[PDB]
Amino acid sequence: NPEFFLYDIFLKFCLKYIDGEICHDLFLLLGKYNILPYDTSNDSIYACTNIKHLDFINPFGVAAGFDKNGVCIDSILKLGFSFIEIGTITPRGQTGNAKPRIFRDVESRSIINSCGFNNMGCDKVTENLILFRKRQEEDKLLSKHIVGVSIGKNKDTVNIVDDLKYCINKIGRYADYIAINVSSPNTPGLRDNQEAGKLKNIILSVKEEIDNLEKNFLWFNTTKKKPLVFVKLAPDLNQEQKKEIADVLLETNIDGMIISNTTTQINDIKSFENKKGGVSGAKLKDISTKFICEMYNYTNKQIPIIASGGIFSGLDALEKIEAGASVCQLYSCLVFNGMKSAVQIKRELNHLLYQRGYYNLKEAIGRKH
Ligand SMILES: Cc1cc2nc3c(=O)[nH]c(=O)nc-3n(C[C@H](O)[C@H](O)[C@H](O)COP(=O)(O)O)c2cc1C
Ligand SMILES: Cn1nc2c(=O)n(C3CC3)ncc2c1[C@](N)(c1ccc(C(F)(F)F)c(Cl)c1)C1CC1
Ligand SMILES: O=c1cc(C(O)O)[nH]c(=O)[nH]1
């Protein structure tokens, strides 16, 4: 498309001279005024995918933390993504940790960030999403797109479940699915909530609040159904903990599990030495894919997987799919490849299934095993 490629020229300049968050702000500003490129081409019906009754028109979305406030949904989706996960949001607004809090190593295609759940808050983001859903009702290019909401807790909150209830009660009826973020490394003490008991109570409380929205049309979202419940897991756990978690998720009946968030155990990027925050990008790819393989077995194939971590190429995506993933989220690939990310990776993925003899994307899930 003539429009996508023009932004590629500025991409290398930005990654070299401009601060990361200015780049983020500009991208949100471009999309706010609908001057970002569009991809209105039909997607391969053999590349479509689904999680339960959620039907994704293609297997690529944008991971949480990119449009943390839902102010740029239309333009991002129209870049060629099937869905976007907004958030992570909290009940009360937060400015996050001090800036600068985002750093990029172009050579390794890696990012380290210490944002700290900066967001307008549930109320304002809820307003933004309500505005999007109204625009969705009048734009054909948005009728089949999916919007999930990642929810979290304020830094000063003590109990996580209390904050999760507020988000569900206010933005729950506008979300196609809810992602439980208990894996951020930039808010103290959160990852400790991944212990089985606490995670079990979290999932039941989140699933209880969603089911209770009906009791007290209701679903002003894409599906017209109640939102599914997903959990995003951190990769820095030992094997016994992963086993407990798998047992919890299945027992609690989780609709899916995102794998994964950022990691804190990587220490071989020279420009990131002595910096706080979680690391994203290519270096996280192989680590995350194994977390899927492990969890996919621990779950006995009964819990769908959503892949997030170092996905840059169509083959990187098929590695995630064949490992057990049903859909993929991008974040760093967007940062380092830009407006063309979705078009390039969708074209590459279609080329791949053709050579490998697959009938459709569904045939590839877990074929690695
Ligand atoms: C600057 C930055 C901010 C992020 N913010 C969030 C967030 O708010 N909530 C969340 O669940 N994940 C967040 N993430 C993690 C991403 O969603 C994703 O898991 C990570 O970037 C790895 O994917 P990638 O290798 O394709 O970049 C953030 C990542 C980065 C780099
Ligand atoms: C270079 N870039 N850096 C980013 C970054 O650091 N983030 C934050 C989350 C961590 N998000 C997006 C970042 C981009 C981005 N590739 C970009 C920004 C601005 C321009 C320009 F030239 F129009 F101004 C261009 Cl062409 C491309 C954006 C499209 C995904
Ligand atoms: O889940 C998360 C959250 C953050 C943040 O808000 O700082 N950053 C990440 O890399 N992952």
**Ligand 3 centre from 67 Cα, in Å?**
12
Nearest atom, ligand 2, residue 7 CA: 26
Cβ neighbours of residue 231 under 8 Å, at least 6 residues apart?
179, 180, 182, 199, 203, 249, 254, 256, 257, 258
Pick the residue whose CA is nearest to atom 1 on ligand 3. Answer: 184
Give domain limits for the chain.
1-369
What Å resolution does this PDB entry report? Answer: 2.9
3-state secondary structure the chain: CHHHHHHHHHHHHHHHHCCHHHHHHHHHHHHHCCCCCCCCCCCCCCCCEEECCEEECCCEEECCCCCCCCCCHHHHHCCCCCEEEEEEECCCCECCCCCCCEEEECCCCEEEECCCCCECCHHHHHHHHHHHHHHHCCCHHHCCCEEEEEECCCCCCCCHHHHHHHHHHHHHHHCCEEEEECCCCCCCCCHHHHCHHHHHHHHHHHHHHHHHHHHCCCCCCCCCCCCEEEEEECCCCCHHHHHHHHHHHHHHCCCEEEECCCECCCCCCHHHCCCCCEEEEHHHHHHHHHHHHHHHHHCCCCCCEEEECCCCCHHHHHHHHHHCEEEEEECHHHHHHHHHHHHHHHHHHHHHHHHHCCCCHHHHCCCCC
**Ligand 3 centre from 112 Cα, in Å?**
10
Residues flagged as binding site for substrate? 68, 113-117, 181, 186, 261-262
Active site residue 82: no
Query: Of 118, 232, 261, which is best to mutate to test ligand 3, by the most ligand atoms within 8 angstroms of its C-beta?
Result: 261
- Is residue 344 lining ligand 1, measured as CB closer than 6 Å? no
Alpha-carbon span 337 to 282, nearest angstrom: 12
User: Phi and psi of 359, rounded to 5°?
Assistant: -75, -45
**Ligand 3 centre from 337 Cα, in Å?**
21
CATH, domain 1-369, list 3.40.50.450, 1.10.1740.10, 3.20.20.70, 3.40.50.300:
3.20.20.70
Residues flagged as binding site? 64-68, 88, 113-117, 181, 186, 232, 261-262, 280-281, 308-310, 331-332
**Ligand 2 centre from 42 Cα, in Å?**
26
